[PDB]
């Protein structure tokens with residue numbers, strides 16, 4: 001690929017100038033060895049003081065891998081890079097991917113290092129391996145080839161990838177392959193044994209076109225909007241009915257026709273919270289009518305590709321996390337729950353970081369983009385620790401919730 | 413003639429769309445002109461500048477200044493205009509090492525690389541932008557016009573290009589001599605090692621032999637400074653480090669400017685003098701911009717200052733870093749949102765100290781502040797030593813476990829152990845998860861008239877206890893908190909409380925232990941006195957019993 005593709009920034013925007021955050025000694029050492037080899041291979045080059053730009057870097061370990069990996073935080077460059085319609089007016093996201101019984105995620109980011117980057121754009125990819133305690137100036141590099149995690153990389157390489165996959169797609173017309181950034185998502189409705197067979201049948205095809213051997217197994221079969229469920233009890237205390245009326249009143253913002261009048265009637269007076277209140281027939285019917293309403297889907301819910309996806313997360317305790325994805329309040333496009341996060345029974349922040357990556361993966365499969373997270377954590381705690389548990393080659397956007405939402409109860 | 417390598421030129425550009433400077437030269441006295449001709453004639457013979465013709469359309473004004481005892485004129489080219497129009501550079505010298513992060517070195521030599529500076533050539537395509545004019549005697553001949561061939565002193569890019577050029581020249585020498593350390597500061601080059609003075613003096617000569625490859629002569633720094641090195645405000649001694657003398661002045665009249673200079677010294681000193689505090693002296697600056705305004709010191713600000721004078725009475729020092737020992741960080745609560753800490757490897761031998769001050773907020777608690785201090789120290793330690801320290805914290809393991817398992821946010825603090833150093837951080841109240849059997853149930857409510865600011869707060873209970881209190885100059889949110897306060901005041905040690913105030917719930921569910929609101933603080937004092945409190949929420953105006961009854965009581 002001698003010819004580079006002309007790449008520009010958006011009008012009236014300069015390159016990124018993002019501060020490098022401090023790194024532990026062992027991560028710096030990892031980055032020095034990685035970048036030394038990358039420099040020997042021509043993928044990056046040392047830059048001079050005439051280049052003032054910067055994008056942060058750090059070091060991670062892919063899922064269950066002892067080898068250090070470099071990850072560049074290109075979030076700032078990506079939003080400053082021109083919008084892309086490299087080949088066509090757009091890539092119609094495959095609505096069938098989310099329907100496949102199984103979906104496997106292959107890391108094909110290594111393919112990017114075979115395409116040279118436009119010489120005039122390279123300066124905007126500058127990054128710094130920091131020193132410890134400022135004892136030496138950081139090591140300054142820029143990219144010579146398509147970098148992993150950059151918006152332009154999948155767009156520029158798309159003509160090549162589509163040709164690499166054509167023979168495989170030709171034989172398997174029922175296998176849906178989707179690409180997001182550095183990752184290929186390969187899904188099939190086959191029996192789990194038959195599905196896996198083709199994945200290795202797909203990378204070997206890739207290895208002969210110029211790999212990683214890493215995978216990820218999803219099952220979008222079970223992704224939807226979880227229903228609102230109400231308790232089924234034989235005896236209701238005053239407290240139980242107050243909680244139920246509160247939940248139903250919350251639900252009434254989502255579902256029309258929710259009523260609480262007959263249930264509130266039961267609370268006539270000033271009763272001790274632990275007192276048992278018998279349900280009347282009128283309240284039982286009303287509760288049944290509410291229960292029926294809650295079985296149906298929410299009215300007027302639709303994905304608008306022009307708006308951002310928003311993801312909220314609640315800590316429920318004991319390793320459980322609930323989350324909702326929406327664009328407009330009370331119009332959830334998907335909701336879910338997580339339990340027993342792996343290898344983090346005593347670390348909230350690791351559990352939250354893993355939830356963020358799982359939710360982002362689901363968002364990519366369903367809509368082809370990442371949501372903006374509302375994180376139940378103080379900014380300084382998240383910003384100190386999240387890179388310690390990150391294992392994905394993309395990074396979403398996030399904001400911080402500092403006031404406890406009352407609705408955590410309702411998703412319990 | 414020994415061939416020397418050329419120092420690689422950095423390509424420089426002007427900011428997009430901008431042209432070079434075109435500033436008029438000022439008229440100069442005959443004496444200043446004579447001086448500038450003399451000076452520039454010498455710079456010309458050394459290659460620093462070159463005469464140019466009149467086709468160059470750019471110009472930067474030049475001046476002639478002098479010192480009182482120095483019986484000579486000084487040249488000065490004012491590159492302010494050119495700097496506004498020159499591209500940004502990578503400024504690779506903003507941060508400096510912290511002494512506590514350095515390992516001691518047996519021997520340190522200083523080299524002067526002032527003359528090496530002038531061997532760094534200026535990008536030739538950019539030289540035209542540096543043109544200046546020496547006016548002629550009596551303006552009867554064309555002025556003498558020059559341009560720079562070297563990095564001009566005062567030009568935007570000279571510091572970054574100079575340091576970058578040296579670093580690249582030094583890199584092979586540092587990589588192939590891992591038993592020395594090299595550090596550059598201004599025109600100074602600092603070389604240290606743990607070699608015997610013999611092998612050390614040899615590495616220095618080898619470094620000189622290396623620099624000659626680019627024609628760079630480097631003698632020793634005039635009047636070799638004995639220890640300690642006076643550098644960036646520190647005293648670097650062979651075995652110890654400290655800040656330079658911290659001397660607090662005596663005064664009976666303190667202005668808004670005096671208090672700013674005292675916090676600066678105190679802040680600087682807090683990196684080695686443990687227990688420094690600057691809240692009460694900072695509070696006297698909350699909002700003002702006239703520095704000469706005099707602000708009386710509160711009896712609390714005087715105490716704080718006197719406490720600092722006690723700490724500052726005698727000098728202290730930190731030790732240098734030993735990578736083979738553990739790194740340990742200990743935190744103490746000081747009060748009023750203030751925190752101090754020490755980082756050390758052996759007991760009583762601090763690497764450095766520090767402080768942390770609570771963020772501004774209507775509410776907060778000690779555990780959140782301790783967590784924030786931990787994150788700050790964590791980040792500082794990574795900067796200085798490239799690793800997180802082990803923490804010693806004045807909070808019981810069981811207190812922390814209760815906090816993070818029940819707190820609604822994710823939270824985390826790295827490996828740490830309890831240190832029994834009062835005052836200990838604790839949880840002051842914990843609400844029940846379930847309603848309490850046999851405890852009286854208070855339904856509370858409050859309301860206020862927006863226009864008149866008149867309101868009411870009260871409660872009704874399942875035992876028929878009731879109260880409504882009329883309030884003046886209040887708001888809905890205030891009456892809602894006042895109602896919870898009354899229920900706490902009038903109930904036994906165990907109580908169930910039912911509110912419809914999402915605002916009140918949001919406050920209490922944040923688990924504050926102190927507030928800027930005196931009413932919230934009174935509520936906190938009541939919660940601390942209870943054995944069990946269950947707080948439940950219901951939506952207003954839905955006909956919920958008890959809540960409906962009290963709502964009408966406080967709504968007129």
Ligand SMILES: Cc1cc(/C=C/C#N)cc(C)c1Oc1nc(NC2CCN(Cc3ccc(S(N)(=O)=O)cc3)CC2)nc2ccsc12
Pocket residue numbers: 135136509514515516517518519520521593594595597602603604639641642643648649650651732
């Ligand atoms: C080498 C050096 C010197 C200075 C001084 C500036 C001034 N003004 C600053 C820095 C950042 C330096 O840079 C590094 N300094 C160290 N360590 C130091 C070495 C010096 N000692 C103090 C000392 C020791 C011996 C004598 S003596 N007996 O020769 O008179 C005099 C003073 C403390 C530790 N480590 C590194 C690692 C990478 S850079 C670098």
Ligand SMILES: [Mg+2]
Pocket residue numbers: 857858859912952953963
């Ligand atoms: Mg009310």
